[PDB]
Amino acid sequence: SEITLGRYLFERLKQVEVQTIFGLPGDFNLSLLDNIYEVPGMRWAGNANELNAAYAADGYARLKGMSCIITTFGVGELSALNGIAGSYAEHVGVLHVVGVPSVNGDFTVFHRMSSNISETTAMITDINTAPAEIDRCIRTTYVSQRPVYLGLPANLVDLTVPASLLDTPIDLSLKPNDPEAEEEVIENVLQLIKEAKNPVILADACCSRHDAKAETKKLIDLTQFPAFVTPMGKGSIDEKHPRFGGVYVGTLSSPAVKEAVESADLVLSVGALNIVEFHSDYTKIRSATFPGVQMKFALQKLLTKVADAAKGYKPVPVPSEPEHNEAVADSTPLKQEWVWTQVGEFLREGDVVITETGTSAFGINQTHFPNNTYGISQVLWGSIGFTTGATLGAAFAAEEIDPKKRVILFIGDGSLQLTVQEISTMIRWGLKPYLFVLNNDGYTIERLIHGETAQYNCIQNWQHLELLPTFGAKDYEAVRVSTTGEWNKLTTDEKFQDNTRIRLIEVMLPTMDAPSNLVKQAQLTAATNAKN
């Protein structure tokens, strides 16, 4: 019993819970894409461009575990590179499959360019090794949580392989740690906890996706050591935990936090990216690296002895934050510093919260999350326009995990323009995210760094409210809000709290308005001779 190599790839992806395939059709992938619709429960998103398709891929993978984007030779694959690169930077497992031609010259140039931002690459040439090659690409995507480049010649896709190949699972397991090296780490780490009187735990972004979110809460529960998140790790620790201290942003952490960490005699850095760092692939203790000793197992073994070594530690108190705003008049103009606190009131368990590079990125580090809130903020790579695509991907994946689950984007009016057309494919699929667009008449974060009045921080002014209908939506909500009362009236409306249709909320804000600790930040950077 015989299937196409095409069908084999999608059946493989299906087995790793990848239901939606991103990308755009072209000459060298059309035959491959047919196979999607021979595997039940699979779909082609039909993206509005390849850059957006890769951002969506990224989004999808963050929620689902990995993703797949298919493009065409040259024109397709090159359009996606900034997306791929961001996935590489932030450790998101995205399989990039390029349909290529049959098997200035140099048909390999694009393959070499993607090698730079890929964990591994394959150019399938051989119908007989192709199944193992696909399998190795998927494993590597999943386990390494980095993009993988798979070139698939258009003449091999509809060549057939034994269906019973699908009956051996792909091995998604980590290879264990060298016990001796691992025992060394544990030994040392345990010594450091025995000495220290005031350790903190720092959760970085890797908690969620590498499943050490569960190990991280147990370390907290067993130590009662205070626990903070980086902007990227925000959501990794449920924020209603007594020992949650808040978001460590370094120089920009609210004062309590800033010193709270800095005052610590031992830092246990988890998912990181007298200090101990647990990374997915290795760990480091003070200066000494320890390659191969993986956080999953390392941390597992640590939990079994952590109580013992922390016997004596007296739980240090932790930063509270002004959970709620004050009442003010209904006519009060919206300000960023009011909005990110108020956004707390609106979030629920199970929400996916996505914040664009800009004010939104800083803003959300001031918002209280309920438990089981999945944060997405691309603080390392920092490519504006990311979040539009990422919203689509996340909304697909959240659809397949749990329909209840709400997708909430905060995007600047600037950032929206780069990737605006991907709203289209949200609509075509009847996805129902909350698109909060921060209209501050341009690039306010840059206005905050250089050229308050420079023309390159000005943007063409769009009619946000008409985006949805223009892109062909027949069942939607678009609304503008400028005041406290307008915000409250919309967001405490129970109708509105139900992810019942795609919504665009245009949030009218001053041009120079910003979260207070971005504000001060540049009050500090513009008065200083510290420079680049």
Ligand X SMILES: Cc1ncc(C[n+]2csc(CCOP(=O)(O)OP(=O)(O)O)c2C)c(N)n1
Q: In this structure, are residues 374 and 409 in contact, taking their beta carbons and an 8 Å threshold?
A: no
471 binds a second copy (CB under 8 A): yes
Q: Tokens standing for 488? A: 């409250």
What is 30-61 written as a DSSP string?
Answer: HHHHHGGGGSTT-EE---SSHHHHHHHHHHHH
Q: Is 55 annotated as a binding residue?
A: no
Contact set for ligand X, span 436-475 (CB under 6 A): 438, 440, 443-446
Q: Which is nearer to ligand X, 306 or 448 (CB)?
A: 448
Residue number, 48 or 306, with CB nearest to a second copy: 48
Quick one: 350 or 382, whose CB is closer to ligand X? 382
In the chain, the largest separation of any two C-alpha atoms, in whole Å, equals 73
Cβ pair 178, 293 in contact under 8 A: yes
Contact 442, 457 (CB under 8 A): yes
Residue 117 interaction partner, one of Mg ion, a second copy, ligand X, none, beta carbon < 5-8 Å per kind: a second copy
* 253 versus 419: smaller Cβ distance to Mg ion: 419
- Looking at the Cβ atoms of 440 and 484, the one nearer to Mg ion is 440
> 454 contacts which partner out of Mg ion, a second copy, ligand X, none, CB within 5 to 8 A by kind?
a second copy
> Stretches 2-10, 24-32, 244-252, 297-305: which one binds ligand X (CB under 6 A)?
24-32
Task: Look up residue 33 and give its two tokens.
Answer: 């894409």
Pick from 351, 413, 422, 477 the residue near Mg ion by CB under 5 A.
Answer: 413
357: contact with Mg ion by CB under 5 A? no
Is 262 annotated as contributing to ligand binding? no
Burial class (CB in 10 A: 0-12, 13-18, 19+), 44: middle
Is residue 211 annotated as involved in ligand binding?
no
Distance separating alpha carbons of residues 373 and 350, to the nearest angstrom: 5
Q: Which of residues 68-127 bind ligand X (CB under 6 A)?
A: 72, 75-76, 79
d(CA 96, CA 70): 6
SS3 of residue 249 by DSSP: coil
Cβ proximity to a second copy: between 344 and 412 the closer is 412
Distance of alpha carbon 265 from alpha carbon 275, whole angstroms: 9
27 is in an annotated binding site: yes
**Is 446 known to sit in a ligand binding site?**
yes
- Residue 160 vs 417, nearer CB to a second copy: 417
128 Cβ contact partners less than 8 Å away, ≥ 6 residues apart: none
Segment near Mg ion (CB under 5 A); pick from 90-98, 342-350, 391-399, 439-447: 439-447
Residue choice 231, 235, 393, 412 for contact with Mg ion (CB under 5 A): 412
Residue among 59, 199, 246, 385 that touches ligand X (CB under 6 A): 385
Restricting to residues 69-88, name those near a second copy by CB under 8 A.
Answer: 74-75, 78-79, 81-82, 85-86, 88
Q: How many CA atoms lie within 13 A of 33 on its CB side?
A: 21
Nearer to Mg ion, 230 or 440 (CB): 440
Residues from 10 through 39 that contact a second copy (CB under 8 A): 24-28, 30-31, 33-34, 37
Tell me the closest approach of the beta carbon of residue 381 to ligand X, in angstroms.
Answer: 8
Whether 384 has a binding-site annotation, put simply, is: yes
Dihedral (CA of 476, 480, 483, 486) sign: negative
Residues 406-435 that bind a second copy (CB under 8 A): 417-421, 424-425, 427-428
443 assigned to a ligand binding site: yes
How many residues sit in the footprint of ligand X (CB under 6 A)?
A: 28
Taking residue 38's Cβ as centre, other Cβ atoms within 10 Å add up to 13
Of 190, 216, 215, the C-alpha closest to 201 is 216
Q: Could you say whether residue 220 binds ligand X (CB under 6 A)? A: no
26 sits near Mg ion (criterion: CB under 5 A): no
Query: 3-state SS string over 388-414?
Result: HHHHHHHHHHHHHHCCCCCEEEEEEHH
- Nearest 5°: the CA angle 471, 474, 480 is 75
d(CA 417, CA 390): 15
On whether the CB atoms of residues 313 and 306 are closer than 8 A, the answer is: no
For ligand X, which stretch binds (CB under 6 A), given 19-27, 57-65, 135-143, 192-200? 19-27
Annotated binding residue 470: no
Q: Could you tell which of ligand X, Mg ion, a second copy, none binds residue 254, using a CB distance below 5 to 8 A set by kind?
A: none
- Residues 361 and 370: their CA atoms lie apart, in Å, by 18
Binding-site annotation: residue ranges for pyruvate = 27, 446
Binding-site annotation: residue ranges = 27, 359, 382-384, 413-415, 440-446
